[PDB]
Design a binder for these strands. Sequence first.
DNA 1: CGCATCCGTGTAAGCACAATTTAACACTTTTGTCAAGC
DNA 2: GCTTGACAAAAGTGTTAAATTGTGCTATACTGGGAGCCACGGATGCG
Lengths: 77, 49
Amino acid sequence: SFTLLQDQLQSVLETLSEREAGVVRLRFGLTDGQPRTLDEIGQVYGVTRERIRQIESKTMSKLRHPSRSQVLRDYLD
Amino acid sequence: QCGLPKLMALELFKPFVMKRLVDLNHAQNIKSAKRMVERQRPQVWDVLE
DNA sequence: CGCATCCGTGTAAGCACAATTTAACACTTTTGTCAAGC
DNA sequence: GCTTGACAAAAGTGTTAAATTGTGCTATACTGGGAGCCACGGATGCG
């Protein structure tokens, strides 16, 4: 089932959000394995710390939507 | 032919039953199907058949 | 050269000092947060 | 939509105290353990 998570939670929700989840891959280190602070993922590009702070909350609100939220309910005990 | 008890057959064929339940959308994922089977809901027996 | 008998075998430290490791405290840097405006 | 600056909380550096661990010393005389509640096959001396 954990591998199935790598098929669902890791993949499909990312395809439908573009960089709104692409930054999340760097946030928790889904690529290269490193979770990264706001500056580290921001300083290399033209986005500031506060903007990433806002984007994280926006993504959290977006994924709280019932349509996306209901799918992942079964992968959390 | 041989007669096999329902309780025994379900426990032997649990993974096949879980797969078939997931395919027919009775369960969302593997954990959901396993939990449904462990409670022995009425819909499990038809899939086992 | 074959048989009888012998052997191998599957009831009583504690102290002192030095050295290393671990925690507690203090301050400083960094991170996330909030409002407000550009 | 994005940026700036003050602020609170969490994460580092370093010093210090403490707990935890390792090594050495003690001069009446004492000097050689104590446990313990079988049958089978292969080989060598003898007649």
